[PDB]
Design a protein around this nucleic acid. Structure first.
Lengths: 98, 82, 107, 93, 98, 82, 53, 93
DNA sequence: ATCGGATGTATATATCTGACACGTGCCTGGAGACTAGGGAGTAATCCCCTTGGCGGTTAAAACGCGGGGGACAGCGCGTACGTGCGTTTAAGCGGTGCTAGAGCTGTCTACGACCAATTGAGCGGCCTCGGCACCGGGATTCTCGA
DNA sequence: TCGAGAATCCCGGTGCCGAGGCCGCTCAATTGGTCGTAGACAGCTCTAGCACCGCTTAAACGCACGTACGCGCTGTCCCCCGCGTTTTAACCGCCAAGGGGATTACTCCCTAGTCTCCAGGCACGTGTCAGATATATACATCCGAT
């Protein structure tokens, strides 16, 4: 008979190993293309350092995991294990991002 | 070479990977694009400000020290890039 | 020896000479751009104009000739751009703009 | 002891915008403090930038750039215009 | 027969008039005594400006009504009209005050 | 003249007045003292830092400009006091 | 940092050790909580209701 | 281009505290950036307080006061004591 | 869902006033004029990082696919909280009075400023080699059905 | 609940390049005069703070009490976790062109610095009305009976 772990369990171990790991979790090229797309909005044909864009993606992902973290916390205060967009919105609200 | 729609280039698996790193168990769909937006909005500032530096730098390429001073001015300073 | 202040030379009000002396005594750069005081003071003139204008709007909205700091708080809280400019700033005798949340109303 | 201020100038621009509307001394000193704060903001920012440019001189281009950094969108735009006007009016002296 | 307004209603009008009013809502002397008590902890027999302490109390009360405000908001996200200490604690948490 | 216990000098009516100003309808008791604590903690910093200024000011009285520069350094600047 | 690295049986000290120590010292954290750390990751933090049963 | 840093003194004080330890050059750069951060912090705060004191001379009293303003509790206390001992040593000759 | 009554609130009025607009004489910072240096600006050169493309891989993303797990809606109760009314209480006015300490001026002096002469501490650059990263494999331990 | 199985920990071995150590090679640090000056300090004010004390009262504390939101529990739906499969494009490695970044060398426009003079700003008086305050009033709105 096929076995399937209970829900979250696999995701739980994923959480554990991700707090274990430290490297990026975003594919480089898509992020870079997104950055250049954003750039051409303000000015077209602008070049970048690989170090620069690595910094962009690292700092972003840091802000992003922080947002995910405190939104997780808020959802704890929301007594749910599922996340709700309003949690993120109000988190930014408390983060003065509104 | 006009770019577009790389925002959805952010994979939902990537988003949930970041969430698991943040220690999140259950997530809804409505978040990701929302997430993406925020992401955009967030970077929406820095690059501009960054190239603003590059603006005054009178240069065509954009450097790390730009975003360094941005995050500094954005009160989100980072280390390891001079 | 005809005299004419740089403010009149810019046809403005803020004292270019005074602000120039101030930035000089402010220890920010060794040399200065002579037109930078003019430019900055013009910017100050502009922003001050907008904020005082909104203040007076609230004031005569309240039949108030002399503007009260409450007018100032209301003005700075109404405009999105100025509020963003002065979000983490506090104002003496400011108070809070009128704001009632939806669910606060009884049904 | 002489203590400088800008109540004269704030009253001037008040009249220039609202000859009718009055002013309170409390809010007056509020205005004064505020403009001092924002002037120090722009001063520090421009000095920081020029130090990044390692340029011991501080000029108007720095001011434009740094206020653009400072102001939320359209304000700056509007702002810079009059600023330009100013220096033009002063360069045309 | 004696009349009594329904709950909150009187407090609701109090909210309305307080958003209407702008002056302080703390008695001066108790606040001042508290400040001097706090002061002697770091150094004893220190004097103050009435303007200084007025600034202290105003700025405090501002921070305090801001805390009450966003904790009210959080309690909205908590779907309650009653406040809970955890709301304040987690608000400070999002306010980076932890 | 040794002072004490002025923290409870903060009246619960005062606290609820501030809350109503903040637009709050229903409140619990457990808050007030908790509130007070925070209050204390909050001011716990500034006065010290303030007198720290006065420390370097080499003076016995404490001035407003002290707390001005504190709230500035505390990123909570205030206007109307020079 | 050396404490952390030797705890991890490591001579060469990688930024992860330093980030962990940062989020391990409360006063230093307070000094640097507003600071971001390259190759920092997140110090292991597990929430209560997150645990299974 | 002659660029200046402190990683050599980092290695020095490391051996002073941990002789049997290596570092990632990445981490060295991070630490050096941190050095620069704290330096600019303390310098700006000192200049600002001297401005409040209208002082044009930044001395060790300013140093200690600004550190106390910045560092918390025993961090500040130990730092004050260390700077005091060091300036005493230097002034001893 | 309405009406009646209670109550709370927006208004006109009167006058009091004390902030406040206004005007002064006097001060000095600002303007005006003149000199120097040298930061800044321009230009030609080099480099060299970047931006571009090309091909192979798969780990990763897309997508589907149950399905138990909790979001949520509802439902009982009860305790905690608004409220209005009692009570008592320090808060505020205000005015008094002393001076400790800010707050000002006048020295005089040590103290960097600064420059010049000197150089070795330090930094770019070049080996080098060993913890460290990866890998494969074996043993350990959590977990989900008994 | 004792196993099966699965994800993981750890162990040994492989190969590597960054961490590091050392080497030319300065310019920036030191040293030593020298000078004008920031402030250290003394020594005056005076005033704002600090405390005193009385008088009035709005305010604060507590009570009782209704009551109604907080909370706790149930059942549902749906939906997001987990796993399986299929597709892809990030990555990675390599190549290549140039276009910008950085550099240096001139060159000089502009600003710092100086000195002169005065006129706008500032402290300081001075009537004086915007609005604070109180009062009676008219309007709005809740709460309970119908």
């Amino acid at each position: 008979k096929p076995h399937r772990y209970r829900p979250g369990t696999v995701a739980l171990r994923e959480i554990r190993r991700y707090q274990k790991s430290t490297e990026l979790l975003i594919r480089k090229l898509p992020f870079q293309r997104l950055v250049r797309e954003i750039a051409q909005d303000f000015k077209t044909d602008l070049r970048f350092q690989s170090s620069a864009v690595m910094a962009l993606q690292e700092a972003s992902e840091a802000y992003l995991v922080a947002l995910f973290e405190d939104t997780n916390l808020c959802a704890i205060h929301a007594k749910r294990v599922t996340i709700m967009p309003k949690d993120i919105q109000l988190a930014r609200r408390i983060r003065g991002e509104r | 070479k006009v770019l577009r729609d790389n925002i959805q280039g952010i994979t939902k698996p990537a988003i949930r990977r970041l969430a698991r790193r943040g220690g999140v168990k259950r997530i809804s769909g409505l978040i990701y694009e929302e997430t993406r937006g925020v992401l955009k909005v967030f970077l929406e500032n820095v690059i501009r400000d960054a190239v603003t530096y590059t603006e005054h730098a009178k240069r065509k390429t954009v450097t790390a020290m730009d975003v360094v001073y941005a995050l500094k001015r954005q009160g989100r300073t980072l280390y390891g890039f001079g | 020896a005809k005299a004419k202040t740089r403010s009149s030379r810019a046809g403005l009000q803020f004292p270019v000479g005074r602000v120039h002396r101030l930035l000089r005594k402010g220890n920010y750069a060794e040399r200065v751009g002579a037109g930078a005081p003019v430019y900055l003071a013009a910017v100050l003139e502009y922003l001050t104009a907008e904020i005082l204008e909104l203040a007076g709007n609230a004031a005569r909205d309240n039949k108030k000739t002399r503007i009260i700091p409450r007018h100032l708080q209301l003005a700075v809280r109404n405009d999105e751009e100025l509020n963003k400019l002065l979000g983490r700033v506090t104002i003496a005798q400011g108070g809070v703009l009128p704001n009632i949340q939806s669910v606060l109303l009884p049904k | 002891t002489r203590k400088e201020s800008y109540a004269i100038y704030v009253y001037k621009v008040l009249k220039q915008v609202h000859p009718d509307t009055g002013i309170s001394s409390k809010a007056m000193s509020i205005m004064n403090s505020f403009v001092n704060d924002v002037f120090e903001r722009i001063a520090g920012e421009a000095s920081r930038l020029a130090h990044y440019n390692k340029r011991s001189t501080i000029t108007s281009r720095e001011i434009q750039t740094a206020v653009r950094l400072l102001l939320p969108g359209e304000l700056a735009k509007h702002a810079v215009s009059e600023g330009t006007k100013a220096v033009t009016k002063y360069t045309s002296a």
